[PDB]
Amino acid sequence: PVLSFLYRWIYDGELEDTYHEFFVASDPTVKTDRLWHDKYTLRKSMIPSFMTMDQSRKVL
């Protein structure tokens, strides 16, 4: 599941969850021009130990 969340986020760059399972902290609002800085933020508790901080940061 977490690798399929990664490969849905390399392809289309959009994913759907209602439970915290991935290293992205999504904000549901669509914003106006603030969209870039704030809809996607780095959640660190869902980073695997076979991935590093660089991998999550770059794919985000």
Place this chain on the structure above:
Amino acid sequence: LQQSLELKRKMLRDKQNKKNSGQHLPIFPAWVYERPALIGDFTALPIGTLPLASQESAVVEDLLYVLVGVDGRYVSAQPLAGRQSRTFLVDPNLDLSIRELVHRILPVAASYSAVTRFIEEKSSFEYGQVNHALAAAMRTLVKEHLILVSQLEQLHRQGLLSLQKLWFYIQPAMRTMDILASLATSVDKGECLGGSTLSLLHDRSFSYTGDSQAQELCLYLTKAASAPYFEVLEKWIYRGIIHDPYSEFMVEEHELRKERIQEDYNDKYWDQRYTIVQQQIPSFLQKMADKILSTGKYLNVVRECGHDVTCPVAKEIIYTLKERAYVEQIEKAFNYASKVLLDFLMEEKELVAHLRSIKRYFLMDQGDFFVHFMDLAEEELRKPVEDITPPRLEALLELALRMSTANTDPFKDDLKIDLMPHDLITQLELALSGLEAFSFDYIVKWPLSLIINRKALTRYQMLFRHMFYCKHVERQLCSVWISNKQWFAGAFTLRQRMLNFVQNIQYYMMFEVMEPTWHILEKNLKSASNIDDVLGHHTGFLDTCLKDCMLTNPELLKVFSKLMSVCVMFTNCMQKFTQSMKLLVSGFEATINKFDKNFSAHLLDLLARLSIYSGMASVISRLDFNGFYTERLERL
């Protein structure tokens, strides 16, 4: 038994602090100790009062239960529930002839239960890498022991066995259990783990050379145990990244990534960042150890910058008895390492031009550049120290460079004018500079800081500063020559001799030192099979070029400094006396003759102090090529 529980936790702790990406390491659950999940191996009548034809059937059936490590019926397993020791008690009143034979069967039993306990105690999550492989490889022999016990099990089911058959049966198996129990005792006793029980497994295989029943046993467990180790090895070898997410390997990577990044000030790659560790050497890879280290050390600095490198081919290698699959792959791996690094560097981040643009200025290949720059910078240069300002000297450099036809090399703005802060003490005043100093900082680039060192650059500066005295005295002698296009005819001879001397000194450095060993270096850096030869060739070029020239002498030649001092004193005096006569013939000769005497002293001392030394004797032969001032003082 008790000693293991300590080690296991501490081996965990080393790897939580070394990895900053280690996450949620386990605790061993308490129930595995409170309730049995490790060890599973932990009415009674006197046999002597029984009839005979019940005693035989009963003692055979009970001892068969007793062997596994737990109580039978009339033979009991004495409680220890631990270490390599176990004793069994048959009833003392058994008939003497049968009981002495029952006592003889017991050594396979005490060397079975012990053999089981090593597989039960050391199934824990932590211990060394070889011991975890060895548990899974020793259990295979427990299974092959069972297939003989399975035949025995069927036979005992069919209402038949006797003690003489059993005694004849267990004679082959006793030795194999003896070898396994001795191995378990030695591995637990010495507190050896990791790679230090890859030494013990290597030594025990050599030790047996009289039967080779146990030699092959140690060989089988070592060939099984070296199969994960060589895959971790091939991960480190074919690409610089370790694709194993533990560090068990003989190479470890220090984290000096937070000291040197986008600059090198230690040369961390070639010192000890990728180092080897003694207690993870298996003691059959010790012959290959330096090669193994140097291989992947070369791979990192190509796999980092963006060049796709992978395995060209990989093949399995195994520890085999006094024979090597490993050597043939280590050598090919080594040549592949050095070839991809050396090819990638000699095309992108060109070493060729970096060495050429050092030969062009410090060893001096363009003279037009310096005859422009020295002339247009000397009036700032002549002043005492801190009266110079480096923006101005840098700006006039950008002149004399861009006027001169030296515009054909990529690295020419890397030259920045700095000074030696402690000027003559760097060689092996502080109020004068630009009369005894002229130095640059040529900046060295990211992989060219590992092939040209800091020490290399300061030696280049010291050789350039040694040539600065000749560069100074040469052009001062030309400018005093144009004054005479009164005087003294011997003053013209003194002038002629001094300029002849300095011109010969530099020409000898030209066609003797820099150009020939540069011609050797353009062969050596392309005929190397490792980069520890390439470093050696660069260090050897600099070492030769310093040893042949006058930078290394037994006595260091203070007369060289005194000689160039009286050369400067002569040109100052002659310019002053010529302009304050026409613009005598006796006092002029009086000052010029004293400079003649001082110079002849300092020259003859030089020829004698160079003749004791030593090829590089060509310096003495060319100065006395005439047979004038041909060394009239004897020493030695």
